[PDB]
Paper text:
Here we present a cryo-EM structure of the light-harvesting 1–reaction center (LH1–RC) complex from Rhodopila globiformis at 2.24 Å resolution. By contrast, the Rhodopila globiformis RC contains a full-length tetra-heme Cyt with its N-terminus embedded in the membrane forming an α-helix as the membrane anchor. Eleven copies of a novel γ-like polypeptide were also identified in the bacteriochlorophyll a-containing Rhodopila globiformis LH1 complex; γ-polypeptides have previously been found only in the LH1 of bacteriochlorophyll b-containing species. Collectively, these data show the Rpi. globiformis LH1–RC complex to be structurally unique among purple bacteria and provide experimental evidence of a phylogenetic link between PufX and the RC Cyt subunit.
The Rpi. globiformis LH1–RC contains 36 molecules of BChls a (32 in the LH1 and 4 in the RC) and 17 keto-carotenoids (16 trans-carotenoids in LH1 and 1 cis-carotenoid in RC), the latter pigments are unique to this species. Based on the density map, one MQ and one UQ were identified at the QA and QB sites in the RC, respectively. The N-terminus of the Cyt subunit from Asn2 to Ala8 interacts with the RC-M and RC-H proteins and a nearby LH1 α-polypeptide on the cytoplasmic surface, mainly through charge/polar and hydrogen bond interactions. In summary, the extensive interactions of the Rpi. globiformis Cyt subunit transmembrane N-terminal domain with surrounding proteins and lipids not only make the subunit structurally unique among anaerobic purple bacteria but firmly anchor the Cyt subunit and thus stabilize the entire LH1–RC complex. Superposition of the RC-M proteins from Rpi. globiformis and Rba. sphaeroides revealed that the C-terminus (Leu55–Gly69) of PufX is indeed closely located and parallel to a loop region (Phe27–Arg40) of the Cyt subunit immediately following its N-terminal transmembrane domain. In addition to anchoring the Rpi. globiformis Cyt subunit by its N-terminal transmembrane domain, four LH1 α-polypeptides tightly associate the soluble portion of the Cyt subunit with their C-termini in a manner similar to that seen with the α3-polypeptide (the longest chain) in the Alc. tepidum LH115 and the α2- and α4-polypeptides (also the longest chains) in the Trv. strain 970 LH114. Eleven γ-like polypeptides are located between β-polypeptides in the LH1–RC with an opposite orientation (N-terminus on the periplasmic side) to the α-and β-polypeptides; the five remaining sites were occupied by cardiolipin molecules. The γ-like polypeptides interact over the entire range with neighboring β-polypeptides, mainly through hydrophobic interactions, enhancing stability of the LH1 ring. Moreover, the γ-like polypeptides block 11 of the 16 pores formed between LH1-αβ pairs that presumably function as quinone transport channels; one other channel is blocked by an additional UQ and a carotenoid leaving four channels in an open state.
Residue numbers in the entry:
A (entry chain C): 1 to 343
B (entry chain M): 2 to 321
C (entry chain S): 1 to 58
D (entry chain W): 1 to 57
E (entry chain Q): 1 to 45
F (entry chain U): 1 to 53
G (entry chain H): 1 to 258
H (entry chain L): 2 to 275
Amino acid sequence: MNTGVQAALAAAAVAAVAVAGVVFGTFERPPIETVQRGARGLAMSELYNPRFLAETRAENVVPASLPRLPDVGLKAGEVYHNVQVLKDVSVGNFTRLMASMTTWVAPQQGCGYCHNTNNMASDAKYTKVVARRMIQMVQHINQDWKVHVMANAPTGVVCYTCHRGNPVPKNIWFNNPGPLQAGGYAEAEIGKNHPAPFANNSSLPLDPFTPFLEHAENIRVQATQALPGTDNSSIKQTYWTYALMASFTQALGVNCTYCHDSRLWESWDMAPPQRVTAWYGIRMVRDLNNNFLDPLKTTFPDYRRGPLGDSPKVWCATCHNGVYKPLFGKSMVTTFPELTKVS
Amino acid sequence: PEFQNVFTRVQVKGPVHMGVPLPRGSWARTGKPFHLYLLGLIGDAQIGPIYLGFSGVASIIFGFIAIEIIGFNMLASVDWSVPEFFRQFFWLALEPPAPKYGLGLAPLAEGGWWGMAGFFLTASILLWWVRMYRRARALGLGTHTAWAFASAIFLYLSLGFIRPILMGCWCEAPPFGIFPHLDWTAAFSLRYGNLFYNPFHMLSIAFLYGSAVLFAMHGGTVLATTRFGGEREVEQITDRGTAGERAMLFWRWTMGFNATFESIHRWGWWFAVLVTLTGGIGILLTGTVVDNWFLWGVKHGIAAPWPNVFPHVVDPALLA
Amino acid sequence: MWRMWLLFDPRRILVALGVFLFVLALLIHFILLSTDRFNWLDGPHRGAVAAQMAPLPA
Amino acid sequence: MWRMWLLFDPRRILVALGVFLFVLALLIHFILLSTDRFNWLDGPHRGAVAAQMAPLP
Amino acid sequence: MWRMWLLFDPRRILVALGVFLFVLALLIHFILLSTDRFNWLDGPH
Amino acid sequence: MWRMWLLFDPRRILVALGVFLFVLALLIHFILLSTDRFNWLDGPHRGAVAAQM
Amino acid sequence: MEIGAITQQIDAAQLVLYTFWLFFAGLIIYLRMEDKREGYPLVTEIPGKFLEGFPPMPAPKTFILTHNQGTVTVPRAVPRAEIEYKAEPCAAWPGAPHEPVGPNKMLSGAGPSGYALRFDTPEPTFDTGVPRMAPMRVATDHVFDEDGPNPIGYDLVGFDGIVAGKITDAWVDREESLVRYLEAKLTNDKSILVPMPLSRVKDSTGQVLLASLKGEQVLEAPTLANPDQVTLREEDRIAAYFASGHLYATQARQESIL
Amino acid sequence: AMLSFEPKYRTRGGTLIGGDLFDFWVGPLWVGFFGVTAAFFAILGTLLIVWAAALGPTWNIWRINIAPPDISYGLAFAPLREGGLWQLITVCACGAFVSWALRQVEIARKLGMGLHIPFAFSFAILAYFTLVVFRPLLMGAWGYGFPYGILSHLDWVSNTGYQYLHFHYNPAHMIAISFFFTNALALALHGSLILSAANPPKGEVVKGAEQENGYFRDVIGYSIGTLGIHRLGVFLAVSAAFWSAVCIIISGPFWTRGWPEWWSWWLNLPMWSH
Ligand code: BCL
Ligand code: BCL
Ligand SMILES: CC[C@H]1c2cc3[nH]c4c(c3C)C(=O)[C@H](C(=O)OC)c4c3nc(cc4[nH]c(cc(n2)[C@@H]1C)c(C(C)=O)c4C)[C@@H](C)[C@@H]3CCC(=O)OC/C=C(/C)CCC[C@H](C)CCC[C@H](C)CCCC(C)C
Ligand SMILES: COC(C)(C)C/C=C/C(C)=C/C=C/C(C)=C/C=C/C(C)=C/C=C\C=C(C)\C=C\C=C(C)\C=C\C=C(/C)C(=O)CCC(C)(C)OC
Ligand SMILES: [Fe+3]
């Protein structure tokens, strides 16, 4: 056989094996569960891999909560020395909450993760200082942002919603300008044209959270009329809007059609009510990052902060963790009234 | 079954064909042509010679500099890390200038390299067009190839040169990268409201699909009549044989009308050319005379009335 | 080593050498321009960049 | 086993072996370099970012 | 070195050299225009 | 071992060796530039790195 | 702010679109006229009624040919004469097919055995008026490539397994340097040409397989006027004879198979 | 009416089914058994489309929208006003397309030609079958088919593409587009070269294979030849349809996430994995 033919066949054989390795090592398979949400033939629906969904349901199992004690008797504000936010809670429920917070945040480290074991009133550890601010954040969310966290059902949030039994939640973000590039006259690192984990590992902008979930840059780019004259948004801006919308799909485990009809992205007449809830989710996240997480910058140790020294911040996946509702909508705050009212 | 003429295993080695004598003043052809059995299986076995006139060498020099600008900046964008260059190669690009600078010359780090690469690449493409034109004339051929090439250049110039000028910003132009220029294509549709509703995008797709339809039909027609020497098309044009008659009768009996061995290549020429001609026009319209194509489609009665299965929702930004 | 030029064509070597040396020199000059310390035009102080995520100038 | 060269052409075997040995060695060197433990230049990969964010509009 | 024109076509050398010098000169002028210090039209910022 | 230039064309071997060694040398020089420690032009500490515990 | 508006309802993009429609309508008219440079005007079941259809036939154009083989004007004012095909109509009404006559339907000139009356001269090369197709015994500058089959000396076999002859020489295209015909010495000493596109070279068994003709039908294939060159008309005759076998070699091949 | 050379070619035979019963011409068109079947399916399918349009809210040609059933109906035959008409039109379309391909086989046999044309068309049919039966079958519901409407089926394409949030990153999509774009480039080159040779400047002789092969050797250093370019035209167009069928069949039955995420296998190769 001709050598050129042998090389061509060998190259084709290698490619076929390489393709087989990629195909069988990455692809999913039927059966697939479909949840239709739009009109027939409009291709507005959600896909769910049953094997992936079974794994997801396993890790979103709500832990059982201790029964609530009666609220008659001594109050933790009078009984204890340094109690600033849980003043109105009775002693029995105060102890129940501390046990609940331990399992929700640091089940491995126990009560010693936040407390000096011999002086409970001491605030020497930064974790207790953050925990007190976190309690205020939870109370703020459940009371003032029920337009989002109680949009359809009285779900609310607790410490377990974000922490999931870990001191550091799985999904956080920092100010990220992008990986280090060459200096001088080389094209600057613009936070784009690199694999972006928040944007589904595409080359879309890698930090859509800073302009939108911390600052309040306008997300909308589309014109509201047929002809030009009213819209000067650039394709450059559309990159960051596209990147943020890609992060929404990862955070909720849905696709674009869950909140949009793709034939007109800006349209609210064609949009599901989930788009309204997501709209308030933006404003809630900005409130959490600007008023709670960012002011805690000095309290966090330097290894808990980003490469730029900013405090870790919340986005959609911090609560949702890949599900359209956190813990599939199961509520854990109903038996913790003290976490639903601002002191 | 019958020989399907998929590939040719029986091959003959003849003397190399250097081509017709060139007109006086032309260069000598470059390279010593050689026979390759691998390429003889599917097509012609001879590789070379090549003609490198002024246009060819000038185009290569201009184009090579543009390629160096892209590659150096891509490699600098991973901080000269070769493992990261291989890992991220599809994701890398030379980004167009920032919107601040408009049509002016941007700094090197903020789009200056993009503009120079755009200029040198455009010069290389234009110089290649001269090469396609002049090589056809030197052989006594028509310039149909050059003018078809000009159609492809029109879409290229509309995307990167004409439309950014009409919009007043080089920032609207595509980047020089593989995945990023796919991002630009999608971001273009997102910004200007579903380019599916651009009628010249519809036409360009119709001709893009039509080009695939025609070449499959025409290639299949010639292959089905190679037993009659159907692939000797120019000889069929000037002296029609049974291959031409059967090809014409196959399509006449199939769909009621037919082309000729010459006119089918006119159908194919225009269908390919109209892909980028209508495409270029459609790109020049968006953002200049139309800002949202779906709303333009609604205005002109082409938006299908899909039912809304959700309760009515009000823009929450209005009530805030 | 004069005997090596009977084996290698001087035309091929000189043309390949000239292209290789220019590209190498162009690459090295670019690498220096891609550093703050060895940038000989604007100097060690890199200029501030404009906002990419910005609207069209209107 | 010297008869192995009566069966295969030595020119192809050495070229194939040389290409094979370099690609494998390049593969192994790169796998170790990408690790934190066996990276012999800097050690663990810190993932340095750009010094400052690109300014907002 | 007068013998270098015996093995090299002078027509081919001049064409390649002519395009190369013009491209290089365009490259350098373009680089300077994109610098802050050496921009001679709008000047430094 | 000198009976290898009759087996392998010296012109092909030298050209292949020249291209291979230059590409290899480019690869190594490029990798060192990408490192923080072995970059000989700008030197160490070029970007921002998060502190570790 | 309404940029691009001509009236309250007509905008610039709409006008550009209708401009394209006018051009595209003209282009289709132009293309359809170019389609009518061969075979028009149409013939009917009337001795002197011709149809040109819509759009009408275009103005004539002239091709200049190489090596003083004349000028060709299309559409032809007087169409080329047709071969004298031998077939009997299956019915009298228009649209009915006909049945070829004769014991050897491949020689009837009807159906797939028909061919065009092309030039009765060999196709010449462009550089020299030398015939383009030549046997390798004449075109000695062409030799078979190695690592590919060499069909010289193989048996020529029909689809019924009957050996009709032996392959003696190959005819090459002096312009494209490829094989177009295999010359076979038949058992009746006939020396016919077989089309390469209709030949399956089985180098394992040393046979050239014909799926179109039985062994005995190969013996009646057309022969060249002179043994060292083939005219364009002869090329059409040879192709028509072999290719019509797929429909006429056996009665089964012409009837519905299911 | 017949072309000047046509009458000698109108022989009996070449049919697969029926034989002489349907072996006749109507005007320029040959009928055969599958011509009857293709005509039946085409006319009935078109008439059902108009009836489905009559049930709809508009007669605007661009806005007519015939939609498939709900996903909840699964693989069952829905009521006619709720996607059952779409299913009938789909069956008619499948019958019409297959009959058209089979009719072409008989026509090619009647002319003694190869079967390359129906072979090439079969890949177009495969892509349609992938869209309306194969992909819906793997998803378990006929509701996954695209609606029948000139502008409404673009809405299905758009929404389907964004169910994976960036459809450009689909790897089979990239290959299929590369084939479509190359086919158009190849078609433009081939059409130009033949016309340039057949139509030189006025008064100049027509040019043949020497100039045709010589042209692309001069400009690019290689010529594929007349046989190769027509092989390439089929191969590019056929593979564009084949990889189009692949790109959509893997979107949803074999991949339920964003397409850019699929490229993490390349990003995580141990030679450079983070
Ligand atoms: C989400 C994305 C949007 C979309 C956004 C766009 C945008 C933006 C554009 C298109 C365009 C097109 N779209 Mg679209 N398009 C969408 C959906 C589709 C679908 C589908 C089934 O969904 C299809 C089939 C298409 C198909 C098409 C084509 C008809 C058309 C491209 C023509 C072409 O061949 O350009 C390819 C050919 C060129 C670009 C010219 C190249 C010629 C030059 C000379 C090349 C030189 C190469 C050089 C020498 C080498 C340099 C190498 C260096 C290293 C750099 N689109 C969706 C709705 N589409 C283009 C168009 O024309 O629209 C009107 C276009 O600009
Ligand atoms: C990081 C610390 C140091 C440094 C550390 C090292 C170390 C360690 C080494 C080098 C070596 C080299 N360094 Mg250093 N080097 C640094 C920075 C630089 C800079 C710069 C701009 O900063 C430059 C230009 C260089 C340049 C060089 C080269 C002189 C040399 C590589 C030789 C080679 O590639 O042969 C490739 C080319 C050939 C082998 C020619 C082949 C000849 C053939 C066989 C004959 C036929 C030719 C054929 C016909 C044509 C094809 C060949 C063509 C060349 C393509 N270094 C920094 C400052 N450098 C290496 C060295 O010294 O090697 C001697 C080496 O070991
Ligand atoms: C009708 C529209 C379609 C079309 C048509 C079309 N394209 C065409 C043509 C036509 C008719 C040509 O004639 C032309 C051609 O030449 O084709 C063979 C071409 C062409 N279309 C091409 C590409 C192309 N076409 C595309 C699309 C299309 N082309 C449409 C579908 C696309 C897509 C889909 O994106 C691409 C990518 C090219 C293959 C070719 C134009 C080639 C060209 O412009 O060459 C010059 C450009 C350069 C970058 C120069 C290269 C320089 C070398 C890489 C240097 C190598 C090193 C150097 C030697 C070292 C020394 C240098 C010194 C300075 C040191
Ligand atoms: C030893 O060297 C090597 C290492 C081998 C080099 C390696 C190089 C590599 C790997 C390069 C890779 C490149 C890649 C992958 C590129 C991919 C590019 C792609 C996909 C591009 C797609 C589309 C791009 C388009 C349409 C761009 C168009 C731009 C245009 C038309 C610009 C025109 C403006 C002109 C004419 C100007 O006058 C303006 C100039 C000026 C005013 C100064 O600036 C304003
Ligand atoms: Fe052709």
